[PDB]
Amino acid sequence: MTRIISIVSGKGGTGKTTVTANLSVALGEMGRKVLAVDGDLTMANLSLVLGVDDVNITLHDVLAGDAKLEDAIYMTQFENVYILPGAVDWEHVIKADPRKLPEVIKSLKGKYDFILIDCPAGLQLRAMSAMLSGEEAILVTNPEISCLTDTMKVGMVLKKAGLAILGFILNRYGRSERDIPPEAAQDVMDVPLLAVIPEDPVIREGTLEGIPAVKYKPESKGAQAFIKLAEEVDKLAGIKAKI
Numbered sequence: 001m002t003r004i005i006s007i008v009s010g011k012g013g014t015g016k017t018t019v020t021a022n023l024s025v026a027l028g029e030m031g032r033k034v035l036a037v038d039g040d041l042t043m044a045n046l047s048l049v050l051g052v053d054d055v056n057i058t059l060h061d062v063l064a065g066d067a068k069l070e071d072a073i074y075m076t077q078f079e080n081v082y083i084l085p086g087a088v089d090w091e092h093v094i095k096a097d098p099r100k101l102p103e104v105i106k107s108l109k110g111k112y113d114f115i116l117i118d119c120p121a122g123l124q125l126r127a128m129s130a131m132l133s134g135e136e137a138i139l140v141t142n143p144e145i146s147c148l149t150d151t152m153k154v155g156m157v158l159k160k161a162g163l164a165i166l167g168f169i170l171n172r173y174g175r176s177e178r179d180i181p182p183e184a185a186q187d188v189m190d191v192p193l194l195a196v197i198p199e200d201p202v203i204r205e206g207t208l209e210g211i212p213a214v215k216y217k218p219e220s221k222g223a224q225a226f227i228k229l230a231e232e233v234d235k236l237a238g239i240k241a242k243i
C-alpha cells in the first residue's frame with residue numbers, strides 16, 4: 001500500500017522542504033523505498049537540499065509532455081531514497097502543466113513504500129495541484145497562531161478533497177519565547193501532533209550542505225527529532241522491517 005503523502009502548510013518558510021528531505025532520508029534508513037517529489041514548480045528546491053547534482057530531465061519536462069516519467073527519476077546519495085526533481089529555469093517553469101501532477105504522481109503507485117510530495121504553500125493552482133497529488137497529508141507549522149490557523153485551513157480543504165490528514169508537525173520550536181507551546185498548538189489544531197522539531201542550527205547546516213540533518217549529524221537533536229517522526233509516520237508498512 002504505497003503511501004503518497006503531501007507535505008503542506010499555510011505559509012512559506014515553515015519547513016516543508018526540510019521535512020520532506022529529512023523524513024525521506026530517515027524512512028530510507030528504515031529500509032523503505034522512498035520517492036521524494038519536488039511539487040514546488042516555481043521554486044524547485046528539493047534536489048539542492050538532497051544534494052542531487054546530476055540532474056537534466058525533470059518533473060517539469062514530464063509535465064510538459066517532453067519526457068517519460070521513468071527518465072525523470074534519479075537515485076540519490078541516500079539509501080533507498082529516489083528523487084523526482086524540479087527544474088529551476090523559468091522556461092521549464094511555465095511549460096509545466098500543474099494540472100497533470102496528480103495523474104503523473106499517482107501512476108507511480110506500487111513502486112515505492114512512500115512517495116513524499118514537497119508542496120509549495122498556499123492554495124493557488126500550483127499548490128493545489130501538488131497537494132491533491134497525495135492521498136495523505138502532513139501539515140507543517142511554526143509556533144505562531146496565524147500560521148497554525150492558516151495551516152489548519154489548508155488541512156480542512158485537503159480533508160474535504162478526500163485526503164487523510166495524518167497530523168501536524170510543530171517546526172521551528174524554541175525560536176522565540178512567544179512560541180505557542182505544543183499543548184496549546186494541539187488544542188488549536190484538530191489533528192494529532194506528530195512531532196515537535198526545535199529550531200536547530202544543525203538542521204540549517206544540513207540544508208546548506210545538501211545533506212539532511214538526519215544523516216548529516218545523526219546524534220544531533222534535530223536529527224533525533226526527525227528520526228522519531230519517521231518512526232511514527234511509518235505505521236502503514238507494518239513489518240517495521242529491513243528484516
Ligand SMILES: Nc1ncnc2c1ncn2[C@@H]1O[C@H](COP(=O)(O)OP(=O)(O)O)[C@@H](O)[C@H]1O
Nearest residue numbers: 013014015016017018172198199200203204207
Ligand atoms: N527546525 C529548524 N531548525 C533550523 N532551521 C530550520 C528548521 N526548519 C526549517 N529551518 C530552515 O528554514 C528554512 C526553511 O526552508 P524550507 O524548509 O525550505 O521551508 P519551506 O519549504 O516551507 O519554504 C531553511 O533555511 C531551513 O534550514
Ligand SMILES: [Mg+2]
Nearest residue numbers: 016017040045
Ligand atoms: Mg520549500
